[PDB]
Structure 1
Amino acid sequence: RTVLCIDFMVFTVRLLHIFTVNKQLGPKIVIVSKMMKDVFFFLFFLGVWLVAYGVATEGLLRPRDSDFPSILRRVFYRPYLQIFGQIPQEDMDVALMEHSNCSSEPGFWAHPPGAQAGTCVSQYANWLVVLLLVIFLLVANILLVNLLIAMFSYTFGKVQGN
């Protein structure tokens, strides 16, 4: 079943190959393949920034459910969804959490209500976590996206006639 599901996609994306003959869609379908270098540059920059920000935030929060899939999720998947308006403030800001003694280690700890956000996080430098969120939003949602728009415009104008 799983294989066939993916197989369906591979069939559907062949419709484009069918419509290259069309006099209106085809000249645009052939330009779409010229944007892959810009897409790859965007992916490289976004991956570097995601690694840096996610590892820094995971180190600052110190969740007590440090399973490997959970670490990968909170390092890559959760910051990735913030580019699309999914910002779980209650899972990163201790001012929005309930302060309680959830661990025997010294310090102050809070309980985030998220299911995969760790059962207990540290309150030490949470202002730095908030500042990192602000900088991440600025760099990713504003700078990288508009830069990719500019690169797409330049490439489209360059490769139209060819």
Structure 2
Amino acid sequence: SKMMKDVFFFLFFLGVWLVAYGVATEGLLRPRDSDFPSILRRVFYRPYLQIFGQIPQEDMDVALMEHSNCSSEPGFWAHPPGAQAGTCVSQYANWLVVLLLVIFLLVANILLVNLLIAMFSYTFGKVQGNSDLYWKAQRYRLIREF
């Protein structure tokens, strides 16, 4: 219970860093099939499962999909094979998407988790000597209750 001074720091830093990646990705791809739950899902929930070893690349690139023009606004369009990733994805400057994916994975995966390990070690090695005494104090009352 005394290690809850760091999980809130982790949630703060990850939420601030996560919302921006989500909005930038869904601004660059521009899905031409949109609602409220689809956009809210595809902005928050899909980046959150990428820091636990689930990186689907089907809706990110275009060089794994079929070049199909079924859209009416001028440009070039591609067809996703999955579900929930609309039916049309733009192709204008697609390399910026891959570069943002690399930046986000390097920040969340290699810096934050290891920093959180360091903070748990430093907090534990200090507070252990007080927590042990406080546990030794309450044992009489917990015996007396039964």
| TM-score between the two structures when normalised by the length of structure 1 | 0.77
1:44: Cα distance to partner?
0.5
Answer whether contact 1:35 1:152 (CA < 8 A) is retained: yes
Residue 154 (structure 1) aligned with residue 119 (structure 2): no
- What's the CA shift string for 1:15-36, capped at 9, x where partnerless? xxxxxxxxxxxxxxxxxx1221
1:149: Cα distance to partner?
1.0
1:102: Cα distance to partner?
2.3
- What's the CA shift string for 1:119-146, capped at 9, x where partnerless? 1111112100000000010011111111
Determine the structure 2 residue equivalent to 1:10. none
- What's the CA shift string for 1:52-103, capped at 9, x where partnerless? 1000000001011221111111111000000011111011111111111121
Answer whether contact 1:92 1:112 (CA < 8 A) is retained: no
Determine the structure 2 residue equivalent to 1:98. 66
Answer whether contact 1:100 1:109 (CA < 8 A) is retained: yes
Q: List 4+ stretches of structure 1 deviating above 2 A.
A: none
Answer whether contact 1:34 1:155 (CA < 8 A) is retained: no
Which of structures 1 and 2 has the bigger CA Rg?
2
1:157: Cα distance to partner?
1.1
More helix by share: 1
Cα distance in 2 for residues equivalent to 1:42 and 1:125? 33
Cα distance in 2 for residues equivalent to 1:90 and 1:68? 23
Cα distance in 2 for residues equivalent to 1:35 and 1:67? 40
The runs of 5 or more residues in structure 2 that have no matched partner are 131-146
1:116 aligns to what SS in structure 2?
Answer: coil
The equivalences for 1:11-160 within 5 A come to 33-160=1-128
1:98 aligns to what SS in structure 2?
Answer: coil
Answer whether contact 1:109 1:120 (CA < 8 A) is retained: yes
Cα distance in 2 for residues equivalent to 1:55 and 1:46? 14
Answer whether contact 1:58 1:75 (CA < 8 A) is retained: yes
Alignment RMSD (CA, Å): 0.9
Work out the percentage of aligned pairs sharing the same amino acid. Answer: 100
Answer whether contact 1:101 1:109 (CA < 8 A) is retained: yes
The runs of 5 or more residues in structure 1 that have no matched partner are 1-32
